[PDB]
Write a structure and sequence with these properties.
mainly beta, about 55 residues, hydrolase, Laminin, about 0% helix, Protein inhibitor complex, two-stranded antiparallel ribbon, blood coagulation factor
Length: about 55
Amino acid sequence: RKLCSLDNGDCDQFCHEEQNSVVCSCARGYTLADNGKACIPTGPYPCGKQTLE
């Protein structure tokens, strides 16, 4: 368990080992946070989120 195999590489979503080392990315409607790991919703109803309101 190295990069993406070790806890998804610490990414919130997509994880890819780009020439060794991890590179996270997000689904459409999300924007990779400053940390290059978390995924921030671009709008009110982002995909994959259960609605609380």
